[PDB]
Symmetry: C2
């Protein structure tokens, strides 16, 4: 598709057998999703943004669908105000910026 | 241009006389730049993001040149980790996410 930027570029994602809404975020190096329970090996991590840093759990080789596109990568889980799809996953669904 | 996201989508901008480097950020509603002086009246506001909120100064109808493209609108100057170009200007230059 072509997402235009008048409204937040929100998209449906299936992670861990659960459908959710996430933001297509070219500004994020990484992907961050609200507190799940999907078990797995994970390493602790702190990611920074505007107002400071939050603690997250880093899972590796996680499967996701992003608006119907299958992807596989590092997802970070933690108290994020909105589910964010960063560049690690945007590259995998072939997303580009154009103007 | 078409901009892939293997690297951070950074661009040169021209704001309030200074040349600077900024991130084309489709997750940001607003455009926030590291602290610098711009002339004119500004009003204090507060913006959120991961990590929480920060106090910023709002400048209206500011000319910004983004990667050779002209925009004129709101710029929030404050303590951001990185200069970011949000949807309020990305729409001005005709920016769209494509995949």
């Amino acid at each position: 598709p072509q997402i235009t930027l008048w409204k937040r570029p929100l998209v449906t994602i299936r992670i861990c057998g659960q459908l959710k809404e996430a933001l297509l975020d070219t500004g994020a190096d990484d992907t961050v999703i609200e507190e799940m329970n999907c078990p797995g090996k994970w390493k602790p991590k702190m990611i920074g943004g505007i107002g400071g840093f939050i603690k997250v759990r880093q899972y590796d080789q996680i499967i996701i669908e992003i608006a119907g596109h299958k992807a596989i990568g590092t997802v970070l889980v933690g108290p994020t105000p909105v589910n964010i799809i960063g560049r690690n996953l945007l590259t995998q669904i072939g997303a580009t910026l154009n103007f």
